[PDB]
Every structure is written in C-alpha cells, then in structure tokens.
C-alpha cells in the first residue's frame, strides 16, 4: 500500500495550489481519504476528508470555502485545491487513509473505529512573497592538526537559500557512518542555512575523496562539492 503527495511548492499569498495524492495497493473507492497538515515546529491539524465512493466531503473551519477536496476513482487519486492561501497555510501536507468502514458495531458490545494506517511522505507548501534563491555550498575543510590516527571531521555549509527544503548526502549515499545533517536555521536575512558534517579516520584523509551532494529542488539545483584538506 502506498500514498504519494505531489504539488507542493512556493506560492504567493492569495494564490492557489492543487495538491494530488496518488493511491496504490488498496481499495481506494471504499476508503476515506484525509489531508492532515503540520506547520513548521507545530502539531498535526486535520484539514479535510472525502469518501471517494459517494463524493461526500468535510472541512476544518480554518479552510472552509477556500479549500476543496475531491477524488477520481477512475485514477485512484485524491486532490486538495487550495485557494486564497494565507501564511498560516504554510505546512507539510500529508494524505492518509481509513479502510472501510469508519466505524463498525458489534451487537451487545461496542463500536470499533478505523485509524490512519497509511500516510504519504508529505509535500511542503510555503506561502510567501519572497523569491526563490539557490544555495551556495562551501567546504568545511578537515584540520591539518588531526594527527597520527585519531578522528577528523569535515563537512559542507549550505548557505542562503529559500524556500526549504535542502537535502544532503555524502558520496551519493554510500557514506552514512558518522554523518550529521543539521536542521536548517532561518537567518535574520530571511534566508536559510544548514551544515552537514561527517567524521572519518584521520588516516583516511589524503587517500579518500569526500563529496557532499546538495539538492535544492525549489531552484532545480544539484551541487556535488568535493571537500579537501586545504593546501
């Protein structure tokens, strides 16, 4: 079973965006499909639900009249049309499902309720008038003083980008041991920055090559930065 959200991105206040939730591996017609969002640093908030078999819908008061949830059972796909967007709509949007039925009854006993067993990975919607800016990637070079067989650290500084997110890998994903990619920080300038570091054997410097692979999809940017000891 899978759910995959798409359509998120940067949008100006007052603008509109259509999110899609492509379903696979279960009876989409009988399910209930929900949109649940998470604003940065905040909790989960339900937005809307639909029962694809009947077309019935429901909405949170915060979005009634501005958002429309819909479904196409011919394509097993649900949609969230978001209009009149506000900064408070900035969030990761998840699609999730209930298997039918929502609630069942066991005679002479109680009710039994479904829950959200499958969720998508989420798609980020950023409501802002600020413009997209690609990152600059700088080496965090290993020290010359990492002597005689201890541990050295190296990394990459990913500076001055907007909107989120950036992802970082090392050696195209082949290096994960000792990797720490820090949460992005919003700088006072309004642009984000983050760093990614890795620890390696001091002996490995000079014989090994380390590449940080930085992806900023909002600017269609892919940077592969070799991080070397400075000569």
């Amino acid at each position: 079973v899978q759910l995959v959200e798409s359509g998120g991105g940067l949008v100006q206040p007052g603008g509109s965006l259509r999110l899609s939730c492509a379903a696979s591996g279960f009876n989409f017609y009988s399910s209930y499909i929900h949109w649940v969002r998470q604003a940065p640093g905040k909790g989960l908030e339900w937005v809307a639900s639909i029962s694809p078999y009947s077309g019935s819908t429901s909405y949170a008061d915060s979005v009634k009249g501005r958002f429309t949830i819909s479904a196409d059972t011919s394509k097993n796909t649900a949609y969230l049309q978001m209009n009149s967007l506000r900064a408070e709509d900035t969030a990761v949007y998840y699609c999730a499902r209930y298997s039918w039925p929502w609630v069942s009854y066991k005679p002479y006993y109680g009710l039994h309720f479904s829950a959200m067993d499958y969720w998508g990975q989420g798609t980020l919607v950023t409501v802002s008038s600020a413009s997209t800016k690609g990152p600059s990637v700088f080496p965090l070079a290993p020290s010359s003083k990492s002597t005689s067989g201890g541990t050295a650290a190296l990394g990459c500084l990913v500076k001055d980008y907007f909107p989120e997110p950036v992802t970082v890998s090392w050696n195209s994903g082949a290096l994960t041991s000792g990797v720490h990619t820090f949460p992005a920080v919003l700088q006072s300038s309004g642009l984000y920055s983050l760093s990614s570091v890795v620890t390696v054997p001091s002996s490995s410097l000079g014989t090994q090559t380390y590449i940080c692979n930085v992806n900023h999809k909002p600017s269609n940017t892919k940077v592969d930065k070799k991080v070397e000891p400075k000569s």
Partner: protein
C-alpha cells in the same frame, strides 16, 4: 462543537527500560474512537494503537492503550532508544466530522552523560569572494543537550553574531550534535588573527577550546 484532546505531559525525558505513560483527555465523549501515532522529525506519523486499545500489526508489544471514560492512555512498558519521537492522540468519533489531535508529547531518551568532541572550521576562500565569513564549531555526540559555545576573536568574547543548530536525538545511541556558526564580514574577519570556540558541557572536566589562526 469542537472536541478538544488535552494531552499531557507535553514533553518528558525517561531512561531505557522505564515505563512511560502519556495521557489524553477528551472534552466530550469520543466513545473508543482514539488512535495513537508516533512521529519522528520530518517523517510521516506511524500508527501504534487504534480504537483506543488495539495494537496495530507490526507494532512492538511494549506499546499499549487504555480508555477510562474520556481519559485515554498510551503506555510504553520498557522504553527503547528508538522510541524517541513525538506521540499524538487523535479522535474520530463523528463520522465524516472533524478529526482532532492532541498537542503531542515529545519523548526524549535519558542516558548517561557524554562529553562532545569539538572541531572548528575556518571560512572558505570561495565564500570570502561574497564578502562574508562563516566560522563553524561542531560539538559531536554528546548528552544532555545543554551546552555553551563561546566564540572568541583575538581573545575577545563575541556576542550576537552566532546561531546554533542541534540534531535530533540519535535513534541508536541517544546523543546529540550541535553546530554553532559565527558570521562576520570579510573585512572584519581580516582584521583579526585567532578564532576560537570554547565549549562548556557537563561531561567535560573543564571547558575545551579549539582554535585556528587566519591563514
């Protein structure tokens, strides 16, 4: 007719092997229509418990749920390092009606104290072309999260020109790492020689300083 789910505590720190109980009070009857989810930062929530007390397939048996009237509990019988997460309750009593969530409980794994390993990085020549210099100090694999980083430039204490970021707790060893970035103009950077970060952490016998000389 909004149903409020009041979750407590909002945060807790507990050791491996401890019994942890999280409570959720509904503001009106929600029958047994309560689910519990576990969410790791940046990942979708995962279902643990449905219909107040049913354990979802594949979830370890250390998780259990109970209902008493409008009070719901999630218990982790023996906390494990991988259980660091934010946990949420959620009610669904109203058919095709509003779904409401608790505010979340952030569970941290308490472990023994571990001092950071410290590293300092100068700005790159590439960055200096742009007129700004970023100096970075890394504190690696420490516990607890509290730490103090003091930047010194030619032995003069800096203030107001640095920003910190901390990783989420490691799912295996329960440690944190931290970066501090000092941002200066290139011109100011070129006016000074010794760049140092001094780290205070309870796992260290005394503060640790790492430094470099510009050039």
């Amino acid at each position: 007719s909004d149903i409020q789910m009041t979750q407590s505590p909002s945060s807790l720190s507990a050791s491996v092997g401890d019994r942890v109980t999280i409570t959720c009070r509904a503001s009106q009857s929600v029958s047994s229509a309560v689910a519990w989810y576990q969410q790791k930062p940046g990942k979708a929530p995962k279902l643990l418990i449905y219909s107040a007390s049913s354990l979802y397939s594949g979830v370890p048996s250390r998780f259990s749920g109970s209902r008493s009237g409008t009070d719901f509990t999630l218990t982790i019988s023996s906390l494990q390092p991988e259980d660091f997460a934010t946990y949420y309750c959620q009610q669904s009593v109203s058919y095709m009606g509003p779904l409401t969530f608790g505010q979340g409980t952030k569970v941290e794994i308490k472990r023994t104290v571990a001092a950071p390993s410290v590293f300092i990085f100068p700005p790159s020549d590439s960055q200096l072309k742009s007129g700004t210099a970023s100096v970075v100090c890394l504190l690696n694999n420490f516990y607890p999260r509290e730490a103090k980083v003091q930047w010194k430039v030619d032995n003069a204490l800096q203030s107001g020109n640095s920003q910190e970021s901390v990783t989420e707790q490691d799912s295996k060893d329960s440690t944190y790492s931290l970066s501090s970035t000092l941002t200066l103009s290139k011109a100011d950077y070129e006016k000074h020689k010794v760049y140092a970060c001094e780290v205070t952490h309870q796992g260290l016998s005394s503060p640790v300083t790492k430094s470099f000389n510009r050039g």
